[PDB]
């Protein structure tokens, strides 16, 4: 029709235009969800423990120059700041243990493990923990398109054999993808203290280009040699009592020790579709350079204002939509006034009227942490979204008098402020400024609310509790933790063997327990590392082949139990369905019902006449197979004999149900003429 | 009749579609160009 094809063309054009504009909008901007996090800060693991707990009050700076490392003491420390080869200020936090490694778990020879920078070992451990704490089985990531975009610097070397020693301290350590088996791009950047931040930026672009599905972003340091603590001491920049004070009355700029941080990013739509967990959203970033300043290492306010405005424009937001900002503290005598003035100029100018812009800094409580500083700031902000509180440590009372602190709507976070949910969706910003002169700004937003769920269980319903992945770890010993890591104060179910990330494929060892009452894991299974058990399966598998071939047997004629169970008939639905189907198939030729005999209901015939015994067993056997096949166990070479030849044929698909049933009954009846 | 209106609307829609496709191509597959180069190489090479 002349008046219809034109309408169809118009409709197609409108739909295509809408789709094209939506695609353009998606390409130029797209929310990125943070799925999981993992960190290793000096003094304690990660997430809550070393965070919302410590961040409530603060502390740190345990000093204690490490003794495990060589680090000749009684010579580095000297009161004279002008001494040639010494350094003052002997404080400064440090990692509890940096030489720890498992080696055998990741499959590396101890000789190669010894000649290995601690950054790589800590990165491997933290990456495994990060993937684990996301509900994603690490073994399923093999062959995917995830990439790593981290930032690492070279901190000292071993000054003291056919290989290594030219590949372990190689900076470009993308061996994480080698061990895990990834295929995305692997990049190691270096842009001084802001490196992690700019690294993050790169990842975002890839996530919007479709060349990667998920990204791993983070940073690390180890501070192996004394090194910096000496050199900066000769520059009179580092100051004593190394507690860094941000926006106060002190000037130290203390170069705090190591720290490792990693986060996992994925496109929001994919995260919603797959069914992962979303913690926070990233929706814009900006990078720039200080340009020609009054010195190689000197901040420039105009560049910071420009980058802040650029980030705000890229996000498509307004400067009045941000409630809290994390600052690049680095407490010195010059950086803090410049940063404060820049923030007042860009975020000020009649912000609201009454709402002040809260300001804080993590480095005032945990230290500079070298290259992994910026991402560490993220680890603060997101937690503030997940607890409805602003962890305002800021261990300094009197503000800096150089900057016009008053006459503005930017209030220092002296105490603590509620951060509850509700209207006016929460937003935050982080910033980083490196030594080389590269500046970065990032805006983050609270995750959408979707939490309804349901409640089930609490019935009898026996639940398997396959071990928490007894694995390649020493074939022993580690079972201990799995025995004790499952301590339940008040909970139930907790399916570990489920698709849950803990799966770990139970690499080699494996173990199991089945119950519905209590734990019973602290029982024999616990002492299985040094003893035996009572009624629990213990296996020494070697996963010779992960997927074994499967065969079934089908000989009976002698089972003759007293009723082939009935509780499974009532509970398992597939068993009952197959039993009923077989009974219906056999109904129109013989009067007896297999279900009635099975239930031992009154009026059922005794298990003496063969005409009942032979068919009933058959009606059971096939059903059992239907159960096994229902659990992903597919046989290949059923070889059962005697009266089970026909059952095997039915399982093999060579015969129909009614044909086999009628053959069974006829054979039994004709044989019944012979007895004694 | 109504044929003229439908034709005009279809033409405007096609024009907008062409603009959108050009924008997408410039966003994702825009060719880049090389202006000049410099190098220092073993021996006397320079230029």
């Amino acid at each position, epitope marked *: 029709t002349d008046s219809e094809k034109v*309408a169809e063309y118009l*409709r197609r054009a*409108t739909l295509d235009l809408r789709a094209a504009r939506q695609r353009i909008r998606e390409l130029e901007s797209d929310p990125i969800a943070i799925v999981s996090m993992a960190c290793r800060l000096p003094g304690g693991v990660n997430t809550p423990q070393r965070l919302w707990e410590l961040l409530r009050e603060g502390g740190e700076t345990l000093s204690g120059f490490p003794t495990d490392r060589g680090w000749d003491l009684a010579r580095l420390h000297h009161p004279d700041p002008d001494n040639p080869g010494t350094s003052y200020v002997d404080k400064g936090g440090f990692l509890d243990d940096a030489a720890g490694f498992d080696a055998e778990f990741f499959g590396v020879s101890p000789r190669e493990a010894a000649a290995m920078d601690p950054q790589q070992r800590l990165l491997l451990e933290t990456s495994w923990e990060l993937v684990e704490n996301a509900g994603i089985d690490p073994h399923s990531l093999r062959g995917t398109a995830t990439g790593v975009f981290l930032g690492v610097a070279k901190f000292g070397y071993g000054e003291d054999g056919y290989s290594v020693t030219g590949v372990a301290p190689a900076v470009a350590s993308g061996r994480i993808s080698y061990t895990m088996g990834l295929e995305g791009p692997s990049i190691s950047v270096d842009t001084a203290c802001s490196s992690s931040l700019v690294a993050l930026h790169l990842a975002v672009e890839s996530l919007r280009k479709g060349e990667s599905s998920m990204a791993v972003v983070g940073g690390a340091a180890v501070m192996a040699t004394p090194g910096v603590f000496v050199d900066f001491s000769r520059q009179r920049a580092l100051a004593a009592d190394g507690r860094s004070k941000a926006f106060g009355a002190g000037a130290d700029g203390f170069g705090f020790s190591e720290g490792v941080t990693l986060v996992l990013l994925e496109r929001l739509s994919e995260a919603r579709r797959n069914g992962h967990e979303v913690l926070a959203v990233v929706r814009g970033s900006a990078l720039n350079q200080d340009g020609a300043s009054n010195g190689l290492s000197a901040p420039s306010g105009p560049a910071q204002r420009r980058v802040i405005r650029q980030a705000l424009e890229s996000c498509g937001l*307004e400067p009045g939509d941000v409630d809290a900002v994390e600052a690049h503290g680095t407490g010195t005598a010059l950086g803090d006034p410049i940063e404060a003035n820049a923030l007042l100029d860009t975020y000020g100018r009649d912000r609201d009227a009454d709402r002040p812009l809260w300001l804080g800094s993590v480095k005032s409580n945990i230290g500079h942490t070298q290259a992994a500083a910026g991402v560490t700031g993220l680890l603060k902000v997101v937690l503030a979204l997940r607890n409805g509180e602003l962890p305002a440590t800021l261990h300094v009372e009197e503000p800096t008098p150089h900057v016009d602190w008053s006459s503005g709507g930017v209030a220092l976070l002296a105490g603590n402020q509620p951060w509850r949910r509700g209207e006016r969706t929460r937003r935050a910003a982080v910033s980083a400024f490196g030594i080389s002169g590269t500046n970065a700004h990032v805006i983050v937003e609270e995750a959408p609310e979707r939490e309804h769920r349901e409640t089930t269980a609490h019935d009898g319903r026996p639940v398997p509790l396959v071990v928490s992945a007894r694995t390649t770890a020493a074939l022993r010993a580690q079972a201990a933790q799995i025995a004790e890591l499952l301590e339940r104060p008040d909970a139930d179910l907790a399916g570990v063997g489920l698709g849950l990330a803990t799966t770990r494929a139970r690499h080699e060892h494996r173990a199991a327990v089945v119950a519905s009452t209590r734990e019973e894991a602290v029982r024999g299974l616990r002492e299985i590392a040094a003893g035996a058990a009572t009624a629990d399966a213990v296996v020494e598998g070697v996963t010779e082949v992960d997927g074994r071939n499967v065969v079934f047997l089908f000989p009976g004629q002698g089972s003759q139990w007293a009723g082939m169970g009935a509780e499974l008939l009532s509970s398992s639905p597939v068993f009952a369905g197959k039993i009923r189907a077989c009974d219906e198939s056999m109904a129109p030729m013989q009067d007896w019902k297999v279900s009635d005999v099975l239930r031992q209901a009154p009026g059922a015939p005794g298990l003496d006449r063969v005409d009942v015994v032979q068919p009933v067993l058959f009606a059971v056997m096939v059903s059992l197979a239907e159960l096994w096949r229902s659990y992903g166990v597919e046989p290949a070479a059923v070889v059962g004999h005697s009266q089970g030849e026909i059952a095997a044929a039915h399982v093999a698909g060579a015969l129909t149900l009614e044909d086999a049933a009628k053959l069974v009954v006829g054979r039994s009846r004709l044989m019944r003429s012979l007895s004694g | 009749t109504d044929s003229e209106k439908v*034709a005009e*609307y279809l033409r*405007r829609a096609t024009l*907008d579609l062409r603009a959108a496709r050009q924008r997408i191509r410039e966003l994702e597959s825009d060719p880049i160009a090389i202006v000049s180069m410099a190098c220092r190489l073993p021996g006397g090479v320079n230029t």
Partner: antibody
Amino acid sequence: EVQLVQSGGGLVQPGRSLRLSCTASGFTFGDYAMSWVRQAPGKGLEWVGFIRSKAYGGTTEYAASVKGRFTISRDDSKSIAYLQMNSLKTEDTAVYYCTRGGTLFDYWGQGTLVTVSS
Amino acid sequence: DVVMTQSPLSLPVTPGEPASISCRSSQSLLHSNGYNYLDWYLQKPGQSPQLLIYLGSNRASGVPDRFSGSGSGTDFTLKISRVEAEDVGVYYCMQSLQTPRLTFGPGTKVDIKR
């Protein structure tokens, strides 16, 4: 981009004609109407002739309150849309401009002011 | 079966604050499959007017994305997320179920609230 080169205008003096015309480029004349809108000084604008012309039909469709006074004319096959203005009147002093459609006045251009009075 | 048009006729605005304009008809402008025959026109002071958006929500190229159209039946609305200082002009509704359609009439005006 620059398909509106509307030019013309003058004092006319009542009882005269005019050479109002607009030139176009870029697009194709053969599949486009013209339309014409005049804006009175300090008043609302209105369609000069309800043009709805050119294309396959090639009709005229003069507007009401004209009855050939404004001389629809509208030569087409010269990349021009010249509209004759013979037998003018003191009332119709206004700024006239063309258009690039029949019902979708999407693309417009600079108009020309014509005053007929003394 | 002529259809009238109307507008609030007055809407002083300030930068940053959004804006909305309602426009109602006398009879439904729907077609055999919908697609209300409604268009919006804007004239800046000193230049000829240009088309803003047609067929409901089909904002044409070149027009800033801050404009959006909605509505159906006998009522439609034009929304601006953020108002700036470069647009004062005048706005007119336009219908396309007919053809002898004369001048828009009063339309509506935009000024700076003070």
